[PDB]
Amino acid sequence: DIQTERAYQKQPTIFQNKKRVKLPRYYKNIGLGFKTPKEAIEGTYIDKKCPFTGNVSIRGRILSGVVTKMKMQRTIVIRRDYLHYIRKYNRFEKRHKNMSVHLSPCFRDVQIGDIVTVGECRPLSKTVRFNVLKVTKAAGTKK
Amino acid sequence: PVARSWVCRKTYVTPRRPFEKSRLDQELKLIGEYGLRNKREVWRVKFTLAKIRKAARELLTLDE
Amino acid sequence: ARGPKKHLKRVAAPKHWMLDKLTGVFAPRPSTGPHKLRECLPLIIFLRNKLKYALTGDEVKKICMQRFIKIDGKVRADITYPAGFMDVISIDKTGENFRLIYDTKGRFAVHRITPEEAKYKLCKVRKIFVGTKGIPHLVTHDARTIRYPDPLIKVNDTIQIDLETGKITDFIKFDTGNLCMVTGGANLGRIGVITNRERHPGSFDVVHVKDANGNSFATRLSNIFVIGKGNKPWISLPRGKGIRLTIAEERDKRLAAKQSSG
Amino acid sequence: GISRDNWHKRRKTGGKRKPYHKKRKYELGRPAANTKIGPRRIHTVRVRGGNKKYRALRLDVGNFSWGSECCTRKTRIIDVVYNASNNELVRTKTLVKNCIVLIDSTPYRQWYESHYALPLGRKKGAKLTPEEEEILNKKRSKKIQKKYDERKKNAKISSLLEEQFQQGKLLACIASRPGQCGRADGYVLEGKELEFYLRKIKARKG
Amino acid sequence: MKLNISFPATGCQKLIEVDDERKLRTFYEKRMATEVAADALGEEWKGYVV
RNA sequence: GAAACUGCGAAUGGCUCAUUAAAUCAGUUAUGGUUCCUUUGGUCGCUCGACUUGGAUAACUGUGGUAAUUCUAGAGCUAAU
RNA sequence: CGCACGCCCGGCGGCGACGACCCAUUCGAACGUCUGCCCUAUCAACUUUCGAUGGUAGUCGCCGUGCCUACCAUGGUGACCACGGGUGACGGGGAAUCAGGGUUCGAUUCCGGAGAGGGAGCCUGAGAAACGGCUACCACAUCCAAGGAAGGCAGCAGGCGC
């Protein structure tokens, strides 16, 4: 199911060819009181940039956005809305800044409109500097 | 990059209306009474009390 | 620029040096050393401006090039050498000993000590580190490495070193009800008793400190230096004992002393 | 020369950047080593901070580790088989990190034989006339045989490694960048990796 | 075309000018650092190699 | 103590504002993703295998070329952190 | 390498300078995070197989990354003004004016950036794409025994031109 590309997909930490007579999984708690989810501990994907089961460390900023598009692979576009205060007219103006964000295959069923918390880490790509730490499903979505 | 002040300041403000009979006739009495030599001698001191009155006001508005 | 800078313009120099505007263009760019450039006091500024032994740069050079000045029991013939917080300047021929500690305001005090007190200093630990063969290392605030420390000392404790041997005598552990001087921020030189440490995972931990007159002030944990157990200072404190009375009180004390003086 | 910077290319949106400064040194780029298989050739490069960086230009030996039973031996590289990145790097047989190379099986065979008291490689019927291998497989004292019989209990190698040993060329993956450090250190392919790579080269075979 | 000739054994040196084609003609189209017989330059230098 | 070999500095300072419109820059943070002369404090018989070796070059002596320059070729001798 | 000169039957130790892989420290630099800029719609669509947005594997780099290759995927931005254009635009601390709001200015001594006539390439070094360093090519230009040779004031003075 995995190992679709040319090179062999594996977790570089663990050794998988111990002489004997299921594969163990590398994972870590990421601090700041975030819960290492179950698809990370139990699942069978290979992701360099998964913040729980991969080589990337969360440090600096922690922000939240709402999911806009999910079309490019293992990555989403979130949209961060705020108000900017002009001082001449004692009023605000509605602005937005949509940023590219790495979504782990851990967070399996995520829909658009979900309130996604992200954490800053080392530059992953040209435009990607953040990584999804948790997802809150949009108000309801029970039915 | 010279080691100097450049910190100067004007000590007088000239009045907006240049030819008020009331103001000309007022200020000349003070010049003759106290033996000042020009109108700037009066404008200087009008500016010093204007600053004092302004700083007094700004404090007099403050939350007690 | 294309490399490290060597000049320091007199306006861009740290303010607590209290440098005038019309003397020169440049200020003494402190040589690299144990303390930071913004948190030091160069040997030239301390010697010529505070004590006023020297009159000019040539006289400071002449005073120090005779091997007369001795910063932390080691002779220094360098005019721009950064003498910082918790140092023992030992001018030998006059028989004086000075310790650089923050005045009640954001400046260094000319604080004379006794030769018995001028044989140790009070260093804060910055990191504890495991060596090349399980040899534990300390690194203190003044860039001073000590290997084989006490196995108890941890990353915000204060140690007391002997100045010749350069080894730990005692240590004050970072916890509530310990005297701390503030060595950064607006509260620069306030002496008070630690009240509460508030952990902030990711951010800087903020520590609430209480003064001797029930005055309470906070500062981030980076800018704290414990100098005593309970309420007991382990060194001599400057006149005022890091209180910072209000401008209203400081006005009253000044003019009342003037009235009584005459 | 070659600039290695972000400001020469378009923004997240697709607008054109105007370069606010000319090319800097620290934004450097040197040509690719494209290290080949021949007799040892290394050139030194003075890099930023005044450190040294070794360009392996030709390289035939490397420190490979058959790390199933923890046996690593310096071994002679012969040729490259498969490469995940690009396919022309196998034609022009260049070493790059994460290549698939054949290595001399003899140091690993020697060790296995001298350790476990069993033969490896050595097809059926072939006469062992030299008989110094005889002294390595026979003539043990009293309790040493208790040691070598509790040892050879778990001497069982897998079939897919036995096949390669019988031929005389093991498959290994280069784990050290040969262009940067001037080396060819790697590890022998085993189990799941070995099955995956044997299949990929047979799909390449056709 | 002058000849600044030196003698290492003693360690002396003299500038001897030549104004003939056929005397120097032997030197011509010979590379630098080629030990040549200097007999043709004069009756003085009989069986000299320079 | 001239010269000369060696080490270091010449990347700071000074001048101007032509470029440059999320660029520069300012406040806030990150390097757990790096490099660092110098300063300061550590390390510097932790390795199981000569009471001081080697051969050149400069200055200096000497002979030159060019209308020309902080240009330099050839010769004989002698140092090192 | 330098001042000291010692300690018992030929023996026989302090105090300094210089050097040196690594670690920390200092001075930094470099690359990222979040928010913020003047006028323009007679600029409404823009980007992309010669990288535009992602994925895997490398190459290069002091390191993180389309920085650059190979093979995949079809993305990324926009009426909340993208894309293009203008600027008599280096940015900020600040400056003049002001009841309160505000408008205009900021080349200019402090911090940051850029450049050395126009572009490009590199040597040495911890640090430079360095110009009071080198190598060409465009523009300009000095001395020529006619072969060759040496250039760079937006450093301080000063001269033409404007």
Swiss-Prot record, chain A:
Task: Give the N6-acetyllysine positions (modified residues).
Answer: K28, K35, K48
Phosphoserine: residues carrying this PTM: S57, S100
Residue positions, PTM Omega-N-methylarginine: R59
Which GO cellular component term is one of those annotated?
cytosolic small ribosomal subunit
For this chain's UniProt record, which GO biological process terms are given? translation
What post-translational events are described? Citrullinated by PADI4.
List keywords of the entry alphabetically. Answer: Acetylation, Citrullination, Cytoplasm, Lipoprotein, Methylation, Nucleus, Palmitate, Phosphoprotein, Ribonucleoprotein, Ribosomal protein, RNA-binding, rRNA-binding
Where does the record place the S-palmitoyl cysteine lipid attachment? C50
Q: What is this protein called?
A: Small ribosomal subunit protein uS17
Q: Which organism is it from?
A: Oryctolagus cuniculus (Rabbit)
Curated annotation (Swiss-Prot), chain B:
The GO terms this record gives for MF are: rRNA binding; structural constituent of ribosome
Q: Report the domain of life of the source organism.
A: Eukaryota
Q: What is its main location?
A: cytoplasm
Supply the alphabetized keyword list.
Answer: Acetylation, Cytoplasm, Isopeptide bond, Nucleus, Phosphoprotein, Ribonucleoprotein, Ribosomal protein, RNA-binding, rRNA-binding, Ubl conjugation
Where would you find this protein in the cell? Cytoplasm; Nucleus, Nucleolus
Q: Does the keyword RNA-binding apply?
A: yes
Decide whether keyword RNA-binding is in the record.
Answer: yes
BP term (GO), one: translation
Q: Which GO terms describe its cellular component?
A: cytosolic ribosome; cytosolic small ribosomal subunit; nucleolus
Function according to Swiss-Prot or TrEMBL: Component of the small ribosomal subunit. The ribosome is a large ribonucleoprotein complex responsible for the synthesis of proteins in the cell. Part of the small subunit (SSU) processome, first precursor of the small eukaryotic ribosomal subunit. During the assembly of the SSU processome in the nucleolus, many ribosome biogenesis factors, an RNA chaperone and ribosomal proteins associate with the nascent pre-rRNA and work in concert to generate RNA folding, modifications, rearrangements and cleavage as well as targeted degradation of pre-ribosomal RNA by the RNA exosome.
Q: Which family does it belong to?
A: Belongs to the universal ribosomal protein uS4 family.
- How is the subunit organization of this protein annotated in UniProt? Component of the small ribosomal subunit. Identified in a IGF2BP1-dependent mRNP granule complex containing untranslated mRNAs. Part of the small subunit (SSU) processome, composed of more than 70 proteins and the RNA chaperone small nucleolar RNA (snoRNA) U3.
Please specify the portion of the entire protein covered by the chain, as first and last position out of its full length.
Answer: 2 to 65 of 194
UniProtKB/Swiss-Prot annotation, chain C:
What positions does the cross-link Glycyl lysine isopeptide (Lys-Gly) (interchain with G-Cter in SUMO2) connect? K229
N6-acetyllysine found at: K232
Q: Which Gene3D superfamilies match?
A: 2.30.30.30, 2.40.50.740, RNA-binding S4 domain
MF terms in GO: rRNA binding; structural constituent of ribosome
| Gene Ontology terms: biological process | translation
Magnesium as a keyword?
no
SMART domains xrefs: S4
What does the entry list under GO cellular component? cytosolic ribosome; cytosolic small ribosomal subunit; nucleolus
- List residues traversing the bilayer: none
- Name the Pfam families for this protein: 40S_S4_C, KOW, Ribosomal_S4e, RS4NT
Span of domain S4 RNA-binding:
41-103
Q: Which UniProt keywords apply?
A: Acetylation, Cytoplasm, Isopeptide bond, Nucleus, Ribonucleoprotein, Ribosomal protein, RNA-binding, rRNA-binding, Ubl conjugation
Q: Which residues form a coiled coil?
A: none
Domain of life of the organism encoding this protein: Eukaryota
Q: Where in the cell is it found?
A: Cytoplasm; Nucleus, Nucleolus
What functional role does this protein have? Component of the small ribosomal subunit. The ribosome is a large ribonucleoprotein complex responsible for the synthesis of proteins in the cell. Part of the small subunit (SSU) processome, first precursor of the small eukaryotic ribosomal subunit. During the assembly of the SSU processome in the nucleolus, many ribosome biogenesis factors, an RNA chaperone and ribosomal proteins associate with the nascent pre-rRNA and work in concert to generate RNA folding, modifications, rearrangements and cleavage as well as targeted degradation of pre-ribosomal RNA by the RNA exosome.
Report the family membership.
Belongs to the eukaryotic ribosomal protein eS4 family.
| PANTHER family in UniProt | 30S/40S RIBOSOMAL PROTEIN S4, SMALL RIBOSOMAL SUBUNIT PROTEIN ES4
This protein is called: Small ribosomal subunit protein eS4
Q: Which gene encodes it?
A: RPS4X
UniProtKB/Swiss-Prot annotation, chain D:
In this chain, where does the modification Phosphoserine occur? S159
Keyword annotations of the record: Acetylation, Cytoplasm, Isopeptide bond, Lipoprotein, Membrane, Myristate, Nucleus, Phosphoprotein, Ribonucleoprotein, Ribosomal protein, Ubl conjugation
Instruction: Pinpoint the Glycyl lysine isopeptide (Lys-Gly) (interchain with G-Cter in SUMO2) cross-link.
Output: K169, K192
Lipidation, kind N-myristoyl glycine: residue numbers? Answer: G1
Q: Where in the cell is it found?
A: Cytoplasm; Membrane; Nucleus, Nucleolus
- CC per GO annotation: cytosolic ribosome; membrane; nucleolus; ribonucleoprotein complex
Residues modified to N6-acetyllysine: K36, K127
Q: Residue positions of the PTM Phosphothreonine?
A: T129
Give the GO terms filed under biological process for this record. translation
**Ranges of Basic residues composition bias in the record:** 7-25
| Keyword set includes Methyltransferase | no
Q: Does the keyword Cell cycle apply?
A: no
Q: What is its main location?
A: cytoplasm
- For the region Disordered, what residue ranges are annotated? 1-26
Q: Which family does it belong to?
A: Belongs to the eukaryotic ribosomal protein eS8 family.
Provide the function of this protein. Component of the small ribosomal subunit. The ribosome is a large ribonucleoprotein complex responsible for the synthesis of proteins in the cell. Part of the small subunit (SSU) processome, first precursor of the small eukaryotic ribosomal subunit. During the assembly of the SSU processome in the nucleolus, many ribosome biogenesis factors, an RNA chaperone and ribosomal proteins associate with the nascent pre-rRNA and work in concert to generate RNA folding, modifications, rearrangements and cleavage as well as targeted degradation of pre-ribosomal RNA by the RNA exosome.
- Matching NCBIfam families: eS8
Identification of the protein by name: Small ribosomal subunit protein eS8
* Species name: Oryctolagus cuniculus
Name the gene behind this protein.
RPS8
